[PDB]
């Protein structure tokens, strides 16, 4: 009939909006140039989330895809958000540990794949191929999560305990939250259609807010971002 997911779009909008504005204000107040690069990335992550939630709320970034004999709604704008915001989040982790330039290029890379395949999955009309795309995307994601868990922690260990242990909290936050997205896609409106669209918007919304504003509040309050 109508669109019951709207409420969680509206609450996502509110939350990314407040977070964007809060980061903007704290970021403008501080003088340290190193701390600033973190503000700039993190305020930008939130701002993009905000604009994409707000579009969706207003009914944009939505398409119908036929698969399994039905006409099925898919919010593709969501992938336009992730395309930019996930790699910016990795750049935050990467600058915290002084990652080598070519590790960063690998992650951004893996990441582009992850979002690009997720999206193609979300629009494929042969039901089983949707899961082929989904599996590739999850493979790229695991690769990310591996490098953050093995490669970056080893890097963090070269840093003062305070930047290491901030990194550890953020790594920990990223691993738990990111590792849930594939499960939601698989069981929700984009995959098996078990969990309906409203409940799935809710879940992604909570993961997104946690993965960006939650992440942001942890980083941007740390002494670790100061030079
Ligand atoms: C240097 C010179 C360059 C030459 C010209 C090229 C410039 C083009 C830029 C990139 C092209 C993207 C096109 C686009 O369209 O973007 C993506 C999308 C909108 O989706 P859709 O329209 O197909 O949805 C369904 C369709 N149906 C609802 C209307 C029926 O959603 C989004 O990522 C964002 C939506 C808007 C963001 C909200 C904040 C500010 C918006 C103000 C302007 C809006 C004016 C109408
Ligand atoms: C602010 C948004 C965040 C941190 C979003 C993270 C999203 C992912 C790690 C997405 C992962 C996906 C898969 C692993 C496979 C299927 C489709 C994707 C895009 C949802
Ligand atoms: C109310 C919503 C507006 C959000 C403003 C987000 C600001 C994004 O961040 C911007 O990144 C620049 C690089 O281009 C940095 O060097 C800056 O400090 C900043 O202008």
UniProtKB/Swiss-Prot annotation:
The keyword Ion transport applies. The record marks 81 as: Primary proton acceptor. The keyword Cell membrane applies. This is Bacteriorhodopsin. The lineage of its organism: Archaea, Methanobacteriati, Methanobacteriota, Stenosarchaea group, Halobacteria. GO terms for cellular component: plasma membrane. The covalent binding of retinal to the apoprotein, bacterioopsin, generates bacteriorhodopsin. Light-driven proton pump.
């Amino acid at each position: 009939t109508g669109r019951p997911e709207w409420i969680w779009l509206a609450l996502g909008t509110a939350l990314m909006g407040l977070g964007t504005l809060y980061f903007l204000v704290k970021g403008m107040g501080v003088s340290d140039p190193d701390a600033k690069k973190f503000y700039a990335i993190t305020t930008l992550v939130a701002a993009i989330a905000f604009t994409m939630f707000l579009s969706m709320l207003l009914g944009y970034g939505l398409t119908m895809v036929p698969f399994g004999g039905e006409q099925n709604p898919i919010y593709w704008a969501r992938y336009a958000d992730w395309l930019f915001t996930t790699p910016l989040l990795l750049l935050d982790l990467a600058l915290l540990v002084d990652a080598d330039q070519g590790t960063i290029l690998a992650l951004v890379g893996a990441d582009g794949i992850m979002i690009g395949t997720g999206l193609v999955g979300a629009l494929t009309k042969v039901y089983s191929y949707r899961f082929v795309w989904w599996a590739i995307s999850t493979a790229a994601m695991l690769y990310i999560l591996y490098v953050l868990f093995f490669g970056f922690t080893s890097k963090a260990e070269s840093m003062r305990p305070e930047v290491a242990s901030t990194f550890k909290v953020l790594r920990n936050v990223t691993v738990v939250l990111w590792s849930a997205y594939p499960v939601v896609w698989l069981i929700g409106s984009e995959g098996a259609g078990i969990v309906p669209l409203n409940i799935e918007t809710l879940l992604f919304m909570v993961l997104d807010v946690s993965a960006k504003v939650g992440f942001g509040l942890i980083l941007l309050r740390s002494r670790a971002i100061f030079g």
